[PDB]
């Protein structure tokens, strides 16, 4: 989707907010992997 | 004087009654128990370091 990240955002090269559109999904997926591992914290501490 | 013949038979009876065929099986139970934890903690350290980056 990164080509698509620059396909749908071709006129936004004058816009600073194109990088926010870039910065949006990376700020999502950094959190989703935290909580998956944060499940793994409480999952291990039970087993521990 | 305690008899030399029963003093041998006392020790020889002690050498038959021994847990050595049992405790070795008991200790190899705990080592194979603790190996399962070590083989699990390697999965943990290979996961948290994956999370930490």
Q: What is the dihedral of CA A28, A30, A34, A37, to 10 degrees?
A: 110
Nearest CA to B51 out of A1, A10, A37, A8 is that of A37
CB contact under 8 A, A33 and B44: no
- Tell me how far apart the alpha carbons of residues A38 and B50 are, in angstroms, rounded to a whole number: 13
Q: Cα angle vertex B24, ends B16, B13, to 5°?
A: 10
Rounded to a whole number of angstroms, the distance from the CA of A32 to the nearest CA of chain B is 11
CB contact under 8 A, A44 and B51: no
A8 and B CB contact within 8 Å: no
| Resolution number, Å | 4.0
Q: Is B11 left (phi over 0), alpha (psi -120 to 50) or beta?
A: alpha
Q: In the structure, how many helices (H) and strands (E) does chain B have?
A: 2, 0
CB contact under 8 A, A33 and B51: yes
Length of chain A equals 48
């Amino acid at each position: 989707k990164d080509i698509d990240g620059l396909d749908f955002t071709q006129p936004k090269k004058e816009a600073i907010k194109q990088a926010i559109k870039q910065g949006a999904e990376i700020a999502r997926k950094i959190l989703g992997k935290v909580s998956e591992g944060l499940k793994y914290i409480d999952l291990a501490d039970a087993r521990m | 004087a305690q008899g030399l013949q029963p003093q041998i038979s006392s020790k020889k009876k002690l050498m038959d009654d021994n847990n050595l065929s049992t405790t070795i099986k008991d200790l190899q139970s705990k080592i194979d128990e603790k190996n399962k934890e070590i083989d699990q903690f390697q999965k943990d350290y290979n996961k948290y370091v994956g999370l930490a980056f």
